[PDB]
Amino acid sequence: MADRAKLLTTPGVFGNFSTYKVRADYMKLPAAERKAAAAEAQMVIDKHKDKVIVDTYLTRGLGAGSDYLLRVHSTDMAATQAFLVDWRATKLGMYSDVTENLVGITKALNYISKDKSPDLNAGLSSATYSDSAPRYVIVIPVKKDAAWWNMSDEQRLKEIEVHTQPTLQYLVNVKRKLYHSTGLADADFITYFETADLAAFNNLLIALAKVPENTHHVRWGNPTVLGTIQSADVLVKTLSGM
Template sequence: MNQFLAGGILRNLLAGMVAVVMAVVMVPVTAQDQKAEALKMDRSKILSQPGVFGVFTTYKWLPEWYELPLSERMDYVSRVMELIKKHEDSVLVDVYLTAGLGGRSDFFFRIHSLELAKVQTFLREFRQTAIGKHVEVLDTLIGVTKPLNYITKERLPELYAGLASATYTGDVPRYAIVIPVKKSAEWWNLSFDQRLVEMKAHTLSTLGYMGSIKRKLYHSTGLDDADFITYFETSDLIAFNNLLTSLASIPENRYHVRWGDPITLGTILGPEKVVRVLAE
């Protein structure tokens, strides 16, 4: 065979092999990858976008935790903060202090991510830390954020405008409240228009409280035993009590088979401060 011809064949063969390898290694960037890169755990975006998973996990210290020396407990706190830092590009972690506000728990996590598996990885690694080995998991709730389903600009423009314009004007929130909700089969068998009527009454009863109470809804049907996780922040617990009383008195409440059980109330201090308070 001509030497130049053989050399050309070899070069073509090598080029083809390189192309195949590059095709295997260079995985196409998906729309989900682009979305993840765009949000990149930007707090304001993560907490306002649909399609974000929210996981709530509630913990109670095991008795042997308080038998450890204080210096050792404080060292373990720094390990948890390092873990939160390690995963900051994939999960957004908030920690709330519940000790003293209820007998069941001492603290809870609220974790957001575009991928539920990322939350699972963080929680698995947390359980491997010294603090994770000294707590009991009391409850876990899983949900995902979605766009408004009932009160939309097309269906109820005036109510939608009122909802969209309602802004929080209170002090920096001191308290967080988590309430899981499950609806009855009767609710899900209502027509959409019937449910829309109920949700219109629900929304009207809440509008007057939005200046003093922040709220966020997570959809849980099929992901958890609940159908919804309702999360609130406020510094005015009297207004919050009035809001819940108002919601309890509307017809929609007849379709609840679970409303709380438990209701989790905690203070908002920031992850490091909460963990340090608990370690003292």
């Protein structure tokens, strides 16, 4: 296929997030070599378009964990690996060190479904993002303690309703997407956000810090990945001095 809108909106899709630092000797390469990089990045993404989709983000200067982030989706986990193998063979890839790499799967709603929580589910379904086009990405790995998991389905549902009630208002200016990672990475979830309004985003996270669910978090970041949304051309040119 593989269809972007489908891969971004259906259950059973694998999301593969990876962050990299550009090694110090990349900019010591001759200019000619660095000039060719941006086309090579766009072409490797095109080569794999039958199997994966790829988003690029610039993280340099907004955190110390990385210089860029790649978000890759496919219905086949190994296809995401294959893409990343070929990325690493590109000239930029060859001079990149991976600093984080977490995978997860999209799933149907476990908690705030029409059947389990109709009122909040209705508000989740009807919410519409209405701010300017997002400019920033945030990725937050989450892991919850054993005590969380050992609570009942009902106890957990209550806490997730409490998560949902004060955060629905932010769907006008923050896009969200949830991946499930237990067993696949040292995280239970990967959470992914797009916004143009980082003031609003800080307020959103503060609102979640303040609910009892947060008492169960053993990972809620580390790293908190903050970046700017960029096309692959712009990303690679920026990091290549082009």
